């Protein structure tokens, strides 16, 4: 209401007090702001981590002490540079180098030559993602000076059953020879030797024309199969085609397992099939192709 001139003397000092107090609090706040800063420099912690141990392949790593399955860097002898791979290390010192993985249809496998050559998909530290490691790498890993390799295929239907198929002296050629697939023989497997062809019952040569040992890798943009048509193209995949296939792991992902000639764009069976274990109209739920030094596979 406009106090007396005698109020001024006191009222004026009341400001000086809260003003100075304010100042102090500001000095202490700037301090705290300084400490908060040392708290906000780190980046978010990434769950996916790559291990330190490296070798010529997963088995080398598994033999250097590696113990848990995960992402590692490997570098085969003749490899120009190292590359990230997925290693499966069981409790017996076995280290598998996985190069193909299907499990949900997340990744499209209708890729071109180069893509199948360099690889595609994603490597996850828990083997829960689909991918194609890459023909070139597969070649390097399976052709290291005097080291017989073995290939294991693991199937899993939409019921819960899981079967395997093994191949001794597995190998993939250089690009010069279209990464040709070859092996010494079927090493057994309750999944069946679908690499030896299948008597589909549509002709006398079905066996021969659907066998894979010796086949070169083929893609829509690079046909190297034994068929005037384009296997890789009509079946929308990248694979060691003949005319065309008994096994088709990089095939179209069909949810459920059962698909009809109508489901396909061009009648022919183009799913993830393996003739010696299921019908040509049954696509697998989980697919996995891994290799390891042969001598390592049960002596």
């Amino acid at each position: 209401y406009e106090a007396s001139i005698l109020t001024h003397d006191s009222s004026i000092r009341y400001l000086q007090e809260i003003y100075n107090s304010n100042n102090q609090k500001i000095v202490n706040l700037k301090e705290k702001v300084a400490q908060l800063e040392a708290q906000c420099q780190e980046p978010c912690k990434d769950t996916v981590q790559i291990h330190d141990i490296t070798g010529k392949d997963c088995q080398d790593i598994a033999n250097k002490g590696a113990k848990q399955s995960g992402l590692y860097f490997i570098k085969p002898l003749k490899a120009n540079q190292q590359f990230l791979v997925y290693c499966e290390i069981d409790g017996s010192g076995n280290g598998w180098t996985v190069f193909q993985k299907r499990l949900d249809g997340s990744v499209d496998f209708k890729k071109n030559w180069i893509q199948y050559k360099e690889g595609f998909g994603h490597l996850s530290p828990t083997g829960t993602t689909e991918f194609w490691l890459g023909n070139e790498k597969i070649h390097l890993i399976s052709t290291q000076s005097a080291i017989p390799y073995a290939l294991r295929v693991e199937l899993e239907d939409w019921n819960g059953r899981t079967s395997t198929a093994d191949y001794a002296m597995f190998k993939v050629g250089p690009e010069a020879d279209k990464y040709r697939l070859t092996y010494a023989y079927f090493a057994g497997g309750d999944a069946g030797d679908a690499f030896d062809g299948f008597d589909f019952g549509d002709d006398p040569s079905d066996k021969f024309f659907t066998s894979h040992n010796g086949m070169q890798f083929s893609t829509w943009d690079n046909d190297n199969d034994k068929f005037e048509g384009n296997c890789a193209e009509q079946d929308g995949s990248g694979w060691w085609m003949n005319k065309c296939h008994a096994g088709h792991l990089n095939g179209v992902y069909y949810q459920g397992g059962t698909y009809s000639k109508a489901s396909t764009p061009n009648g022919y069976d183009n799913g993830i099939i393996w003739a010696t274990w299921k019908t040509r109209w049954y696509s697998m739920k989980k697919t996995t192709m891994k290799i390891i030094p042969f001598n390592r596979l049960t002596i």
Binding site: D206, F209, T210, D235, M241
Partner: peptide, 4 residues
Amino acid sequence: GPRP
């Protein structure tokens, strides 16, 4: 995939 037996092509005719």
